[PDB]
Nucleic acid binder design. Structure first.
Ligand SMILES: [Mg+2]
Ligand SMILES: [Mg+2]
Ligand SMILES: [Mg+2]
Lengths: 122, 196, 24, 184, 152, 175, 95, 150, 244, 52, 101
RNA sequence: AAAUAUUAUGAACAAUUUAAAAAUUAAUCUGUUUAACUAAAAUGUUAUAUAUAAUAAUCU
């Protein structure tokens, strides 16, 4: 399992995740649509017709469960593991890219340039 | 110490005049030279048979008056100095006599090389085909080669400076007792000896 | 260029794949 | 469930540092012995670093870990390619063990010389210091390969004519003792 | 870049194949060796549990098989199954009729294949022959040898 | 000489005009088509397909402020092992997950350490027997195996390791 | 030397972690066999099972070998799965 | 610390990990023969070899097509999971000689007859088992009939 | 061109890799009835990890580390008893291995108890495997001869023989391996394809089990002094190998 | 080698794979204005008695 | 006069599409001709290391055996030592002393 | 490595060579076709127009 996500979270496994239960059911096992390879050298007189029905198992995923084990809040810009956790405050805040020194800086609209995000963990 | 069957092909020889080469020697050296080479030397007068009084002292060739009127007493320090001067003259002769071949790669029929030759490679080939151990610091490229190197394909050359010549007194016989001209020839060899 | 003097030239089909944009 | 092992035993280094401490980062530059040029590791080099030899799907967990298992925990069966890969790993291990045993028996018999490199390497490379004081068609082929690849260049006959048996001696009057002349 | 400067130790990582794979008891003072000597000695897939058998999904080598015809050993072991004249087959050394062309210097070529690289085969079919590569300069041996007598 | 006449005669309906009417023209047409399509599938289709996928992932990353170059190099560094097809699927159907991957790549989070060489325990150097107990290294390996059993998935065997190790005693008959 | 770690006389892009970190740690830690006496006292107890020849019964007599109990052609039924790959065909191993 | 290391001294060799970085067939047949001796057949192959002068000469001759890494004996003992009191000679004596491609025979016909002799020795082992059973049974029957007549 | 096999080489598909079924006892006959006529005159369990543990345990048992094999077997047997229902094939097999490990460690009473429990589970089972029952009562015979019950050990070996002679098919192991020499089409080279051989000790494990049973029975008969029994057992062993 | 239109790739850039003066831009350009009778598009600087 | 119809080989590695020569480790045609000449010359020199061993009449080639036998059967019918027939054909003189001689 | 079948696919000068055309006005030659499917994959044609240069003034 490389990744487990949802509408509210995303666990990026590097390289793989542990503790995920992805159960499926094997519905079919059959040959897919045949691919025909026709090898015919224009010089000689010899033609080869190679059929390739790609065998494949068709499976329907019944259930996906995830129970992770978190170590703690992780700082993105500092890169350290935070010993304290506070959901009311943003761990890494952001600031607008406008210092007034760049004269030829292409200015976007003020509403998009000065826009603060909300607090999702509250 | 040489085996008798090998020593049969040699003979002891006292060199009267300094001779450069693998079968030569400095003036006043007792050397086992091959039969034919020693015959040539004794016919030309550049060598004698090592008698006892000759091993004590021997008249050597005087280049100032072009005669063999320069008597020399064979001493320890004299033999040391003469061996060192002979080494200097010998490395000069080796470097100035022949070419230095560099087999390298060049994409297509271009005029330049892929990887330019540096002083390390020049010293490597010197040691390889001349049996001369130097440090690459003594090598000096031409003005057009100071920037990149011997990147040009064909006949090239550089300077090899030999510092210790005034202490030995090698200023007269050598055309330039400060530096040597190292003729270099680079060839497009795509064979197993390319390596580059 | 990989052309050279002795080597003969050919007309290669222009690469029309979608290229990624360069980055600073 | 899900399995994630980068090691045979499953053990590894601590993935996360202690809280409030600076983490350790891998070397971003390519492992080139010269200090310059400096080049960031490519994705293939990062794969080699993390243990997947070259491309994905080779010599890594993505190939070693079982592809699936039954819902009741029952493991899969042994594929022919799985057995072949196990034999390939065993072949690598046998190569290593036999090479090491050959080195050990050579050292016990005294066939390892005290001088580094071969005679061709010593005659070619000046950075090495000077150390003083059945059938036979295949054998002939090895002999001719040696004759062709031993001496890549010859001393010019103007200095020492090799047809007469004349050879030049090492003239080390301008040599140096420090290796920095060849290193730098 | 295609010139990668990484320790070639990484090209064959031993992180998942330690010495315990060969010697499972090496951490103790035992040296029981357990190797897969080759890929040939693979007995085949085997079910781990009775509850989960292996599927019956045929392969080409397994399915593309004609029906069995009684051979010499079968008919010699049980003469009751010799019921037709088609069972009385000739020696097994007999392959069959010649199904190809032994085109010289090419081998046994297939019928309807390439003919553009065989004129020696035509000169073999037709009694017309050549071969003056030995006669262009020297005389034949029967012309060079004398006769010991009028009768030989 | 085989030309697949009986196989290619069934697909003359997909052609048109003289190739559909006459047999030889249709057979030549279908033979050429199959040969050229085999050639394209063998040596040309993958380039175009992977270029499309690369362009889509590059546009998705440029919508977030990075590019395919930096994104690929940093995915390799972080050891995520996501094929470009999966990156495209995330970019198109899970934008939040793709943005989380981009944030992981852009952050100064230490990538996972390299794999660890298998180490031999100190119990292997213990003189055994020291003069009916197990070898210390073997007991350590049994404990490690029991822990590895109990770590993967919840089971009724229990989280305790000592009572699971002492199971031969449970099966044993007291004399 | 027996006592010093193997990574002492090493002749040798610095400050960062390399792929051989654990190997370098093992090479830097001191050696675990300090004296040839300990070396031989550990090596004499090393036992070979698949070796050709007889083996002593110094310690116990009632303890019989696996080959002595089940012959040489018979093997224990190994659990065959993706994780456990046993040496199939024990007769192919005999040269 | 400023003194020389005391105690006995152990000699430690090296082993090479050689990786082919270029197509060997693009070069002369002699370089291809050297790479074949190094057991490098295609680009991207990796082999493990001893540090003997023969291997050193081969690597020196193909030093423009391969990348070589060095690992001493202790470094290899640490890389794989083997204790320090266990050498490599005993492991080599333990591993069977019937490993895949047991040797390099001078001809594929010799390889074919070597495989044939392996199969023949297997069949002979089974036949000899059966014949030893028959001989022991015959001797037992002889002794039994003798003791019954007597 | 010769093959160095330096890179990873995928195995070849050969008919010897066919999945051979297991010989099952008929539903009517029961091991309990055989013994009586002789006496007359699922939840989730990390099965991959426990299989690793069981493989390590049998490796220890083959190498001679009997106590470690016993504790490994105990752990994996607890796992199997939890993971499988009553009277299951893998359950009875792993407790066969457990009784063998007990006997090798010297706990002969517990080994005999476990092997008798194996026998009663085999009786309770519907169609047990012939290899399983043969190996179970072979371990029974070895445990009996270790305890000192040589006559009972010989009885167990003889009942192995009488089961394998009445319910085992001697030709099913080499049905698809018999016409394989006919695939070889080359005589100068690659001619081992005409002489491919497959030992029955690798493709019929019941055969090897009964062979070891008869070998141990002959040894016990030679120790006791029963020339008639030794001759009988050797005759049956020769007949079995001749049938194969 | 021609790879683009005269707007993007100039006519003398076709011979860029050759060494020498073809890798430099010429001194004279006759493409604009009245077309030459012999259709000479570019002329490099005179190297002695030779002009390309 | 070589095979114009190139031999086809099953491509198991993608580098077989690039390689032109079947066995690249095998010496070229003229090189292996020279190698075979040299090896056969060395084997011939090893065979002639010892002198030309003179051979009796029975171990002779067929075109000399019966001729040499008939040339002296008449004298051999009468048992007396020292009778020699100087036949024209036979083994030639080595020209130097030989241990077998 | 044997026993058998066939063999006509056809170059003139120059340079060098008891060692390498390394003289580019020189080539040293047998082409070319060759691919099971799905994925993976490390490769390269950009231009720099001024430094013995360019832009400028005084005076003999
Ligand atoms: Mg007549
Ligand atoms: Mg593809
Ligand atoms: Mg011949």
């Amino acid at each position: 399992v490389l990744m487990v996500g949802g509408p509210r979270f995303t666990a990026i496994g590097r390289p793989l995740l542990e503790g995920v239960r992805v159960t499926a059911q094997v519905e079919e096992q059959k040959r897919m649509r045949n691919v025909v390879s026709l090898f015919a050298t224009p010089g000689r007189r010899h033609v080869r017709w190679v059929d390739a029905p790609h065998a494949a198992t068709i499976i329907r995923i019944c259930e996906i469960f995830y129970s992770p084990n978190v170590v703690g809040e992780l700082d993105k810009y500092k890169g350290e593991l935070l010993e304290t956790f506070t959901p009311g405050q943003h761990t890494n805040p952001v600031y607008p890219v406008d210092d007034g020194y760049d004269v030829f800086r292409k200015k976007d609209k003020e509403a998009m340039e000065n826009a603060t995000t909300f607090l999702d963990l509250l | 110490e040489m085996a008798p069957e090998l020593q049969l092909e040699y003979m002891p020889v006292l060199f009267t005049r300094t001779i450069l080469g693998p079968q030569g020697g400095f003036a006043g050296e007792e050397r086992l030279v091959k039969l034919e080479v020693a015959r040539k030397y004794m016919e030309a007068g550049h060598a004698v048979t090592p008698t006892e009084e000759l091993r004590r002292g021997l008249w050597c060739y005087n280049p100032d008056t072009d005669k063999y009127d320069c008597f020399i007493e064979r001493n320890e320090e004299f033999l040391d100095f003469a061996a060192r001067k002979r080494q200097w003259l010998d490395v000069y002769w080796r470097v100035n006599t022949g070419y230095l071949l560099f087999g390298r790669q060049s994409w297509g029929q271009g005029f330049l090389i892929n990887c330019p030759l540096r002083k390390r490679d020049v010293a490597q080939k010197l040691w390889e085909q001349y049996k001369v151990r130097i440090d690459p610091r003594l090598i000096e490229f031409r003005e057009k080669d100071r920037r990149t190197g011997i990147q040009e394909l064909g006949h090239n050359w550089c300077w090899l400076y030999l510092p210790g010549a005034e202490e030995l007194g090698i200023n007269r016989e050598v055309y330039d007792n400060k530096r040597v001209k190292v003729r270099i020839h680079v060839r497009k060899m795509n064979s197993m000896f390319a390596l580059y | 260029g990989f052309g050279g003097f002795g080597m003969s030239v050919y007309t290669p089909k222009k690469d029309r794949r979608f290229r990624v944009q360069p980055l600073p | 469930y899900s399995e994630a092992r980068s090691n045979y035993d499953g053990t590894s280094l601590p993935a996360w540092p202690a809280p409030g401490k600076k983490p350790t980062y891998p070397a971003a530059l390519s492992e080139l012995r010269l200090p310059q040029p400096r080049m960031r590791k490519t994705r293939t080099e990062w794969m080699y670093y993390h243990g997947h030899g070259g491309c994905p799907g080779k010599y890594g967990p993505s190939r070693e870990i079982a592809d699936f298992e039954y819902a009741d925990g029952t493991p899969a069966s042994i594929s022919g390619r799985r057995f072949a890969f196990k034999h390939h790993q065993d072949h690598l291990l046998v190569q290593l063990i036999r090479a090491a045993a050959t080195v050990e028996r050579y050292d016990a018999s005294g066939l390892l010389p005290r001088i580094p490199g071969t005679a061709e390497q010593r005659n070619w490379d000046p950075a090495i210091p000077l150390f003083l004081d059945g059938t036979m068609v295949s054998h002939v082929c090895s002999r001719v390969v040696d004759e062709r690849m031993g001496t890549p260049t010859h001393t010019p006959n103007e200095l020492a004519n090799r047809h007469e048996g004349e050879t030049l001696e090492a003239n080390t009057m301008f040599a140096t003792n420090d290796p920095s002349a060849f290193v730098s | 870049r295609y010139r990668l400067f990484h320790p070639r130790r990484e090209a064959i990582p031993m992180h998942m194949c330690p010495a315990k794979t060969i010697f499972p008891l090496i951490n103790s003072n035992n040296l029981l060796v357990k190797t897969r000597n080759s890929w040939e000695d693979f007995t085949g897939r085997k079910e781990f549990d009775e509850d989960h058998p292996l599927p019956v999904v045929g392969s080409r080598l397994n399915g593309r098989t004609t029906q069995h015809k009684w051979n010499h050993w079968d008919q010699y072991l049980n003469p009751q199954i010799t019921q037709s004249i088609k069972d009385l087959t000739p020696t097994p050394e007999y392959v069959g009729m010649r199904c190809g062309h032994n085109m010289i210097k090419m081998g046994w070529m297939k019928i309807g294949g390439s003919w553009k690289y065989s004129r020696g085969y035509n000169d073999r079919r037709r009694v017309f022959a050549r071969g003056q590569w030995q006669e262009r300069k020297m005389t034949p041996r029967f012309m060079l040898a004398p006769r010991v007598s009028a009768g030989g | 000489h085989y030309r697949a006449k009986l196989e290619l005669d069934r697909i003359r309906s997909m052609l048109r005009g003289r190739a559909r009417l006459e047999r030889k023209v249709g057979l030549k047409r279908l033979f050429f088509l199959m040969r050229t399509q085999t050639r394209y599938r063998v040596e040309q289709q993958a380039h175009w397909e992977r270029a499309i996928v690369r362009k889509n992932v590059d546009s998705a990353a440029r919508e977030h402020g990075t590019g395919w170059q930096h994104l690929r190099n940093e995915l390799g560094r972080q050891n995520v092992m996501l094929l470009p097809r999966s990156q495209q699927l995330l970019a198109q159907y899970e934008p939040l997950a793709f943005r989380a991957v981009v944030e992981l790549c852009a952050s100064r989070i230490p990538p996972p350490p390299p794999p660890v060489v298998a180490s031999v325990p100190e119990e292997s150097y213990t003189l055994w027997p020291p003069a009916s107990l197990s070898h210390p290294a073997a007991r350590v390996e049994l404990r490690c195996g029991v822990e590895r059993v109990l770590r993967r998935g919840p089971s009724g065997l229990g989280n305790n390791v000592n009572e699971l190790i002492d199971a031969w005693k449970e099966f044993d008959v007291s004399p | 030397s027996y006592a010093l770690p193997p990574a002492v006389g090493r002749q040798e892009i610095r400050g960062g972690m390399h792929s051989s970190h654990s190997l370098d740690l093992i090479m830097r830690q001191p050696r675990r066999v300090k004296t040839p006496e300990q070396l031989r006292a550990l090596r004499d107890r090393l036992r070979f099972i698949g070796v050709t020849g007889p083996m002593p019964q110094a310690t116990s007599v009632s303890t019989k070998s696996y080959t002595d109990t089940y012959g040489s052609r018979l093997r224990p039924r190994y659990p065959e799965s993706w994780d456990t790959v046993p040496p199939h065909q024990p007769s192919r191993e005999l040269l | 610390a400023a003194a020389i290391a005391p105690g006995p001294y152990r000699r430690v060799g090296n082993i090479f990990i050689v990786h082919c970085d270029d197509h060997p067939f693009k070069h002369s047949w002699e370089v291809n023969r050297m790479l074949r001796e190094l057991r490098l057949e295609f680009k991207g192959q990796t082999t493990i070899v001893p540090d003997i002068p023969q291997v050193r000469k081969r690597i020196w001759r193909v030093r423009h097509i391969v990348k070589v890494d060095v690992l001493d004996l202790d470094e290899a003992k640490a890389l794989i999971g083997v204790p320090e009191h266990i050498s490599f000679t005993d492991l080599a004596s333990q591993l069977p000689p019937s490993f895949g491609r047991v040797k390099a025979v001078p001809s594929p016909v010799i390889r074919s007859k070597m495989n044939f002799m392996k199969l023949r020795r297997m069949r002979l082992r089974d036949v000899l088992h059966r014949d030893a059973l028959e001989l022991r049974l015959l001797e037992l029957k002889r002794s039994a009939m003798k003791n019954x007549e007597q | 061109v010769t093959r160095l096999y330096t890179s990873y080489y995928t195995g070849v598909l050969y008919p010897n890799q066919l999945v051979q079924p297991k010989q099952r006892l008929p539903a009517d006959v029961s091991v309990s009835a055989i013994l009586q006529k002789r006496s007359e005159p699922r939840p989730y369990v990390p099965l991959g990890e426990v299989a690793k543990l069981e493989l390590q345990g049998d490796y220890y048992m083959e190498g001679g580390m009997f106590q470690e094999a016993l504790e490994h077997y105990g752990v994996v047997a607890k796992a199997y008893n939890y993971a499988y229902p009553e009277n299951h094939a893998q359950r009875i097999g792993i407790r066969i291995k457990l009784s063998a490990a007990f006997r090798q460690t010297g706990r002969l009473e517990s080994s005999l108890a476990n092997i008798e429990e194996v026998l009663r589970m085999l009786d309770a089972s519907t169609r047990p495997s012939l290899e399983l029952i043969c190996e179970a009562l072979l371990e029974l015979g070895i445990t009996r001869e270790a305890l000192g019950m040589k006559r009972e050990a010989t009885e167990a070996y003889e009942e192995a023989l009488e089961v394998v002679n009445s319910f085992h098919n001697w030709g099913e192991s080499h049905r698809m391996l018999r016409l394989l020499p006919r695939l070889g089409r080359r005589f100068n080279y690659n001619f081992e394809e005409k002489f491919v051989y497959f030992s029955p000790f690798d493709y019929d494990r019941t055969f090897a089990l009964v062979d070891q049973c008869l070998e141990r029975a002959e040894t016990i008969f030679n120790e006791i002094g029963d020339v008639e029994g030794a001759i009988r057992v050797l005759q049956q062993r020769k007949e079995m190998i001749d049938k194969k | 080698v021609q790879t683009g239109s005269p707007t993007h790739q100039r006519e003398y850039e076709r011979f860029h794979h050759l060494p020498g003066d073809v890798r430099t831009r010429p001194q004279f350009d006759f493409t604009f204005g009245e077309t030459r009778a012999d259709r000479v598009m570019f002329a490099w600087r005179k190297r002695g008695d030779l002009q390309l | 006069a070589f095979r114009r119809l190139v031999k086809r080989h099953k491509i198991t590695n993608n580098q077989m599409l690039l390689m032109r020569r079947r066995e690249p480790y095998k010496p070229t045609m003229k090189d292996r001709q020279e190698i075979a000449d040299r090896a056969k010359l060395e084997e011939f020199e090893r065979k002639n290391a010892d002198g030309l061993m003179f051979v009796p009449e029975k171990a002779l080639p067929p075109w000399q055996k019966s001729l040499a036998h008939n040339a002296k059967a008449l004298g051999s019918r009468i048992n007396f030592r020292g009778f020699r027939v100087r036949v024209a054909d036979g083994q030639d003189e080595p020209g130097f002393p030989t241990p077998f001689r």
